Every structure is written in structure tokens, then in C-alpha cells.
Design a protein around this ligand. Structure first.
Ligand SMILES: NC(=O)c1ccc2[nH]ccc2c1
Ligand SMILES: NC(=O)c1ccc2[nH]ccc2c1
Length: 182
């Protein structure tokens, strides 16, 4: 509907797959080469389904900060025959607040879904499902069970992936450029 939705759509159309684990279907953001991200609560194993194709996981790393606190991001390398468009230059370098973000989801349950979530706060610490978690972004939209792993964007930046909510607010784990240096 506007330039925010334009940038979000450009990311969804080229840099997302539908990931299925034993814990459900997730929006999964491809970042570069065969490297993607997913919420750590997806519990990625040795095999994952990518757009309903059985795919070997070559590596999976649940990220933690240097205080050894959960970040809720898992970086996955997929045994896929095709690379993602490299979008690392759209990743922020530092922790920040944002105006006018869009949360975008693509699953069997929620195809082609885009939500204008508005102002995004650098919230920081959250007890997420009982797990102390750092680098959380917060937005005032009643997000539902199923939007997790969804890409949070502003115009020109991919800033996070949806990892939870409390019925009134939604919470995203930051993406930082430094996570994807090769
Ligand atoms: N995520 C939501 O809060 C939300 C609101 C209205 C809806 N109607 C169809 C799906 C849906 C999701
Ligand atoms: N609170 C929520 O809306 C919530 C909780 C757990 C979830 N797992 C993946 C999506 C998601 C959303």
C-alpha cells in the first residue's frame, strides 16, 4: 500500500521459505548463500522441510550473547541446490529503535500477510516463555500464535524476526550484520 510494504514484499518474494520442524511451520528468512534464520524454539534438527522438500541441515547454531544469555535466533545452513539473494547490506550494525515497521509472514496458515506494527522499541531484556532473552524489539500489535519467524522491516532495513507476544504486544529478536560475517 506504501513504500514500507514495497520493501517488505521485495524481501518476502525472494528471501523467505516455509520451514517445517516437529514444532510447526515457520516463516524462515534466507540471508545469503544457503544460510537462513529461524526462532530457536523451532528446535531445528538434522532434517528440516523447506517448501515441503526434505532438506539436510549442514549446521545449526543457537545464538547467545557474551553474557551467555539466549538471543532466540538460530542460524541454519541448508543442503539446498540454490542460494538466497545476499541481503546482508540491509541488516543494521547496532541495537536501535525504529519508526514505522512492517511484520511480514508467509505460511500455509497465513500466506502473503503484512502487518503495519508502527513504532519499534529497543526493549532489551525479556523473560520469553520462561527463558531470559536479550536484544528484544517490541511493537504494540496483538500478534497471534503463527507470526513467529516473520520478518520485521523498515524501508531499507531488515531489523528482526518475530519470536513471541503477550496478547497486546509482539516481540522480535534483533538481526545484526555481525551475526552473518563469513
Ligand atoms: N494477528 C492478528 O491479530 C490478526 C487479526 C485479524 C485477523 N483476521 C484473519 C487473521 C488475523 C490475524
Ligand atoms: N505470544 C505469541 O503470540 C506467540 C507465542 C509463541 C509463538 N511461537 C511462534 C509464533 C508465536 C507467537
Amino acid at each position: 500500500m506504501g513504500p514500507g510494504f514495497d520493501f517488505a514484499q521485495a524481501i518476502m518474494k525472494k528471501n523467505t521459505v516455509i520451514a517445517r520442524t516437529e514444532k510447526g511451520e515457520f516463516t524462515m528468512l534466507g540471508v545469503y548463500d544457503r544460510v537462513a534464520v529461524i526462532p530457536t524454539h523451532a528446535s531445528v534438527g538434522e532434517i528440516i522441510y523447506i517448501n515441503d522438500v526434505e532438506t539436510r541441515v549442514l549446521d545449526a547454531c543457537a545464538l547467545r550473547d557474551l553474557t551467555d544469555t539466549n538471543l532466540e535466533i538460530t542460524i541454519v545452513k541448508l543442503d539446498r541446490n540454490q542460494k538466497f539473494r545476499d541481503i546482508r547490506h540491509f541488516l543494521p550494525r547496532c541495537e536501535d529503535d525504529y519508526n514505522d515497521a512492517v511484520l511480514s509472514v508467509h505460511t500455509s496458515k497465513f500466506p502473503n500477510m503484512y502487518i503495519p506494527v508502527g513504532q519499534v522499541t529497543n526493549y532489551g531484556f525479556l523473560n520469553l516463555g520462561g527463558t531470559p532473552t536479550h536484544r528484544i524489539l517490541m511493537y504494540n500489535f496483538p500478534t497471534r500464535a503463527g507470526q513467529c519467524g516473520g520478518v520485521v522491516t523498515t524501508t531499507g532495513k531488515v531489523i528482526g524476526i518475530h519470536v513471541g507476544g503477550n496478547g497486546a504486544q509482539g516481540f522480535a529478536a534483533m538481526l545484526l550484520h555481525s551475526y552473518f560475517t563469513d
